[PDB]
Amino acid sequence: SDLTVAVVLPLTNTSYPWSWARVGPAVELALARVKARPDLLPGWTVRMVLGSSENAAGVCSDTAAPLAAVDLKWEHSPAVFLGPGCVYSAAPVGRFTAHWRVPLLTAGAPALGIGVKDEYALTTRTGPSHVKLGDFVTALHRRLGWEHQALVLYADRLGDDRPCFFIVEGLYMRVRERLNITVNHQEFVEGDPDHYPKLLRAVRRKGRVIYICSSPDAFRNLMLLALNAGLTGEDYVFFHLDVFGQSLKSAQGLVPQKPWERGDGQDRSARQAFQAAKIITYKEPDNPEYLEFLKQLKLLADKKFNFTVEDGLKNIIPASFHDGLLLYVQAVTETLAQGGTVTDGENITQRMWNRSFQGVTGYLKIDRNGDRDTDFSLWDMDPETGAFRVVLNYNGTSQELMAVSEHKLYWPLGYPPPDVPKCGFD
Amino acid sequence: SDLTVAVVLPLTNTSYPWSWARVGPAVELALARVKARPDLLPGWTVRMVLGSSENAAGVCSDTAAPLAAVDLKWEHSPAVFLGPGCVYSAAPVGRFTAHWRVPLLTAGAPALGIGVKDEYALTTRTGPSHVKLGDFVTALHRRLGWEHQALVLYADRLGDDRPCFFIVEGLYMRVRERLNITVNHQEFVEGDPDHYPKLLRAVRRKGRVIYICSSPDAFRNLMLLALNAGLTGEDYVFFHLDVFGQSLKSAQQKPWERGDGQDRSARQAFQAAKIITYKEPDNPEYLEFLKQLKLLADKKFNFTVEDGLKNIIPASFHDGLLLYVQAVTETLAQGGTVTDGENITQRMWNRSFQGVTGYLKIDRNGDRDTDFSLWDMDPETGAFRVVLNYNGTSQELMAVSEHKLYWPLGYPPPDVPKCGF
């Protein structure tokens, strides 16, 4: 009769790209698009039960999430779970659901561990994944001939979801899986200054192609200190792994972005070093269905969720939730058409894997492994105006790097400096 | 009337020191001893429910353990949880129970993580603990004046509960907390021969006082290759982190003997070797407990409890259960009920107790102070035998049978080279 969907996400905290305030309306938009498609779920109406993944402190936890999952399972006997998004919240839930033999859908849980389907069976990831970032990195290195060394620095506390650790974790494992290049890693604490004279030394000694995963303010300071040391485009290059583009402001209409813009006087010195700086983020969908989706998303969140959805890359998470739920519904429908019941997880999942689909985000392809291919844009500054703008794009499925608006990667010497120093490391 | 005790341990697999085959009988012995003391739980009767922490594969899992925990919560509304002992099994359970506001008792879960106050509130550890190994190391390091550096090697088989990683973690963080010296660390894979030339190089480059946490066979091979390379008690020293004494055999010591004509070199090598294990309780009550344990397991639990250092875990489970039972009793004497987690737990913390294991002290943090024995070779016979003893609570070291630790150059080798590494 009616297909029950279990949701385990932040129902009250609205700071996460996957909070109910942002996903709820997106899901409503999805259930609505369902009732309007008679070719989807013949003789089935989708119901929805809600559970919070956040604890008393209001942060997503690895205790409330699975606990809420267990409770929704008993009281409602759902066919599918939605979320959670936090890595540590999702991990136990996906683990429970696989035992339960129930499919899990989420645009969060980007951690490498989730990729192991033997443990995370029936977990389909319809949003970004950090392993995929490794694909992009492999791509960049190939295009620019780097078959030796790279240095990754990452910052992160201990009492949080450790987002920058998982990002680097994905890059590290996938890149080494594909290029054999020696990758050096160094973790630091943003707040503690002791690490700064330590980091420079490490940058100066362990790499030339440098990837930094930190807060926008930390990447700034590092680029400033890099200048003083005499490290510039000449020999060094600095990638800021800013996936959700926190360093840039969105919906500028049509505007050259000032990543470092802070107005403290160091702006000229900043821009000098910000020449060796390139910013890696997720790619914003181009298709018109996306823009129209955001308008509906904004209005509906403001109208019934009491929240104001701002503009930004974080919006692809709720867009990916919307798409994922639709992608699941097509599959259930297909399963029914060939005489399979709705509780046939194993089948519904395989109908979803290794498949392409047209959702609000545009072209999305779930791989053989169960994870949506991720597209990334590489920003760079205009040699003449210095304002950062997308100069490169990477297809997740096609795995190809194609230029944008006739731009070419900036190189002081004209060519990329080698992942090897001029003479030797000693 | 009814004090329900929820049990989450391996009910079918008997390879773990905390298996129900080994722990069940010991717990049954504890409940029985309870029934015989009128001074414990006036007017209350302890009941016990069982849930398996192991998955379909038969191994203790991060999924089955917590799931079983919830079943026992809804079906029985327990006052206390017993187990699990596996780290990745106990972590989520201890977390659920902390949320539920229910005390949890275990003799396993030695990981540093479980020691965190706010995260694992109401979790009392009555068995060994890995941070405590750091204490001993700190004490041992101070004693012989190693004021600078130490190298830690560790290997953990990928499909398991990473036993040796947690061990080294505890040592690493505690030593750094107390001595603030330089502790270099290196992980390797046992079966992988590519790592050996790297381990040796690693020893030579970054370590003099070395602690290895591996299988007995792995520790054997490394000592062979160590001497073969011209490394001996002269400037280097090798400690084997063998907590449950797998390389040895209790109750009645040839850890270097394998019978492959490699025992000549072995002994020469095992000259720089010293073995760290848990201290075997030598009090009479312990001995009498083992025999009763053996019989009860064989007769009602269908299993043969071999002698060994692993037996302290079920003995600790036994004492912990008695320790809790008194605290509840004590809570009841002053008006509290059995579901007063905080009250009962706090009565158990920072308290000394007399159990089959003997003197057990629960610290201010909720963990049993752990005693450790340092085995050493005989300059005469060459057989390893306890030469040192560390009192967990006293934190002081005492020699045994007036023995002396072997040092080829008279005084223990410096934890630093002549001109620097």
């Binding site: 951690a111 974790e169 | 540093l112 973690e169």
Partner: peptide, 21 residues
């Protein structure tokens, strides 16, 4: 530490980050 696929109730932090595979 990146032996990844250690999510296993990973909260278990620490430091120990060296090896070689």
């Amino acid at each position: 530490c990146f032996g990844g696929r250690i999510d296993r109730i990973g909260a278990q932090s620490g430091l120990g980050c060296n090896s070689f595979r």
